[PDB]
Design a protein around this ligand. Structure first.
Ligand SMILES: CN[C@@H]1[C@H](O[C@H]2[C@H](O[C@H]3[C@H](O)[C@@H](O)[C@H](NC(=N)N)[C@@H](O)[C@@H]3NC(=N)N)O[C@@H](C)[C@]2(O)C=O)O[C@@H](CO)[C@H](O)[C@H]1O
Ligand code: FES
Ligand SMILES: [K+]
Ligand SMILES: [Mg+2]
Ligand SMILES: [Mg+2]
Ligand SMILES: [Mg+2]
Ligand SMILES: [Mg+2]
Ligand SMILES: [Mg+2]
Ligand SMILES: [Mg+2]
Ligand SMILES: [Mg+2]
Lengths: 122, 100, 97, 137, 86
RNA sequence: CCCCACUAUGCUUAGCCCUAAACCUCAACAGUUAAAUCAACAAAACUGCUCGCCAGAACACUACGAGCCACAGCUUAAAACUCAAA
């Protein structure tokens, strides 16, 4: 299926960041993936302090990898991202573009509940 | 060739008026209690609008004003009730004197 | 018979059903600028549907997206990013007064 | 300009200065309003202890420590040790919903310290540890 | 811990009016619910007791909303008697 | 009952035990809102069909028997004496 790899890399230089992306994209191809795109969300400050591989990070690079792979490649690829020292945090989620949004006609008003108690003179 | 009741109701202004919400109608003041004014506008119930501060004196019995109707009958049902609660009056906004 | 009798018809004066601000839009977990509009600026707590004004289906998309962006390293938890403090206020909540 | 209630973020440059000092540089007054005590510790921006005071250190015992008069007394005693070290403006970080939560803040003002901000850092878990069982008193 | 300090639950003081800052801060924590949450977390509230409290708080809201909705609907009829004498 | 401290226990894994105010005390399916609305209360009153259960209180969530990884256990479950009420 089509997945989305939210990748947060360690703040490094251009030569080392491209070496990790390639090393990461080659791991997907080895597991049977058909990489489709490589978006860059830019380097920003992390929302909170992340501790990975005996290092306290405060900044990182955000990269998205849209790809297609078999179901068995997710568990094998999640174990590869845990051993890479330049990968702060990496999660694989089902691509949000493979989930059609049902059309909405608007908010349907709800009338107060009726006939909840007997019409007797208590 | 006597006119029926279904023909009166079809050609009546109220019927053709449509929903009263934000409709400009002409009222007639028929009763005044202190500042409050009781106004008829061709409906089942009256509306009670308060005397305008700018020109209070001009609003005497008979004065014809302009209204912006909201409801023709204030009703609502509340928790536990078997019927709607009505205050027996319409909701409208006074927009001054009909200056013919 | 008579031609002035009323006819069986659906209400033509009926007004279209109301829609939420996010009706027809895709709520992603990467859009932290939109997800920060429904959280408290001091505590980071997610607001309810009586404040946000969203529908049940879109209120749960913001909630699910906020929780996923928080644990992924996209969105804070204990506060709202100060960068998104000067964004349009859509929630019905006044603190100071 | 106007006045915002939100603290000035360090990164973005602002014009709010107190005695020529940025918001980050101002020392911090950590107040721990407990149910039976109230501890106050003044530190610098570089986490250097300047003053410490508590109801117990001011000669209160048992149920006299969980009052608003003992918390105020400890604030005056911590505002007198830090005022000798060059402290005027402080950032209050109150922790706890005890009786001496606001009374200690008044005592700091009765010692010559000016409060520029009030921060609440009361520990709230997102369920973590289980509290003691309810009591029948 | 791992978040930035002096952003969350922080209020700045205007013209040395600390009282207003504390009243403002205490109003932010009560509207968000922290105050009561901190008071219910002092002693463990058993699931059955917490489910009994959530129902009571939801049924009181429903009643108070409708009771208020009727008070605002009938306040138009709090004017002087127009038929004084009949 | 209030305070402190600490353990079995609560967690995981592998087996067992098989109980509850397991109660929304309101069986499953289909259907109706008319008629005599319905003792009361509670959560309005009924129809058709079927399975299960119950016939004064107490003795009795007992005894015996049987069965069960249960050996101070669970399930099923009487009677005698007794009362004229519950
Ligand atoms: C209408 N009769 C009521 C009834 O009286 C009963 C009452 O009957 C009692 C039996 O003798 C006693 O052995 C029996 N004792 C037992 N240990 N089983 C009593 O429980 C019993 N009372 C009762 N069921 N309420 O005493 C008896 C002599 C009585 O008068 C017979 O008719 O019960 C009495 C209260 O015990 C009431 O005062 C009477 O009004
Ligand atoms: S109203 Fe259509 S999605 Fe919220
Ligand atoms: K029950
Ligand atoms: Mg233990
Ligand atoms: Mg249950
Ligand atoms: Mg059955
Ligand atoms: Mg019996
Ligand atoms: Mg038993
Ligand atoms: Mg037995
Ligand atoms: Mg036996």
């Amino acid at each position: 299926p089509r997945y989305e790899l939210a990748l947060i890399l360690k703040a490094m230089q251009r030569p080392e960041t491209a070496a990790t992306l390639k090393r990461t994209i080659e791991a997907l191809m080895d597991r049977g993936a058909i990489v489709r795109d490589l978006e860059n969300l830019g380097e920003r400050a992390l929302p909170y302090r992340i501790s990975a591989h005996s290092q306290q990070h405060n900044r990182g690079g955000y990269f998205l990898v849209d790809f297609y792979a078999p179901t068995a490649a997710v568990e094998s690829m999640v174990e590869h991202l845990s051993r890479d020292i330049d990968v702060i945090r990496g999660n694989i989620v089902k691509h949000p573009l493979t989930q059609e949004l049902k059309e909405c006609e608007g908010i349907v008003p709800v009338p107060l509940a009726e006939k909840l108690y007997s019409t007797k003179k208590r | 060739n006597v006119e029926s009741f279904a023909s009166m109701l079809r050609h009546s202004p109220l019927t053709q008026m449509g929903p009263a919400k934000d409709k400009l109608v002409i009222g007639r003041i028929f009763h005044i209690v202190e500042n409050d004014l009781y106004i008829d506008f061709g409906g089942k119930f009256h509306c009670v609008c308060r005397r305008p501060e700018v020109d209070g004196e001009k609003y005497q019995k008979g004065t014809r004003v302009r209204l912006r109707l909201l409801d023709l009958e204030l009703t609502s049902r509340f928790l536990g009730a078997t019927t709607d609660t009505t205050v027996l009056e319409a909701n409208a906004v006074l927009l001054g004197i009909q200056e013919s | 018979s008579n031609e002035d009798l009323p006819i069986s018809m659906e209400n033509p004066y009926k007004e279209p059903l109301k829609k939420c601000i996010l009706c027809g839009k895709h709520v992603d977990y990467k859009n932290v600028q939109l997800l920060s509009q429904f959280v408290s600026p001091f505590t980071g707590c997610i607001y309810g549907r009586h404040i946000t004004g969203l529908c049940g289906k879109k209120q749960k998309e913001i909630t699910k997206a906020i929780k996923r962006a928080q644990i992924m390293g996209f969105m804070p938890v204990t506060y709202k990013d100060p960068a998104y403090l000067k964004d349009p206020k859509v929630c019905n909540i006044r603190y100071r007064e | 300009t106007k006045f915002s209630i939100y603290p000035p973020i360090p990164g973005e440059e602002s014009s709010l200065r107190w005695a020529g000092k940025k918001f980050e540089e101002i020392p911090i007054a950590h107040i721990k309003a407990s149910h039976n005590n109230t501890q106050i510790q003044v530190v610098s921006a570089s986490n250097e202890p300047l003053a410490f005071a508590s109801c117990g250190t001011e000669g209160f015992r048992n149920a006299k420590k969980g009052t608003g008069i003992a918390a105020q007394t400890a604030g005056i005693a911590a505002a007198a040790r830090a005022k000798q070290k060059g402290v005027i403006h402080i950032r209050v970080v109150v922790k706890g919903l005890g009786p001496g939560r606001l009374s200690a803040m008044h005592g700091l003002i009765m010692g010559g310290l000016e409060v520029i901000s009030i921060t609440d850092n009361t520990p709230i878990p997102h369920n973590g540890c289980r509290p003691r069982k309810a009591r029948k008193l | 811990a791992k978040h930035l300090k002096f952003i969350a639950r922080t209020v700045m003081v205007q013209e040395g009016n600390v009282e207003s800052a504390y009243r403002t801060l205490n109003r932010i924590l009560t509207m968000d619910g922290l105050i009561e949450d901190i008071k219910h977390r002092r002693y463990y509230e058993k699931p059955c007791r917490r489910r009994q409290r959530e129902s009571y708080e939801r049924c009181r809201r429903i009643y108070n909303m409708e009771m208020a909705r009727k008070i605002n609907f009938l306040m138009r009829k709090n004017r002087a008697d127009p038929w004084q004498g009949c």
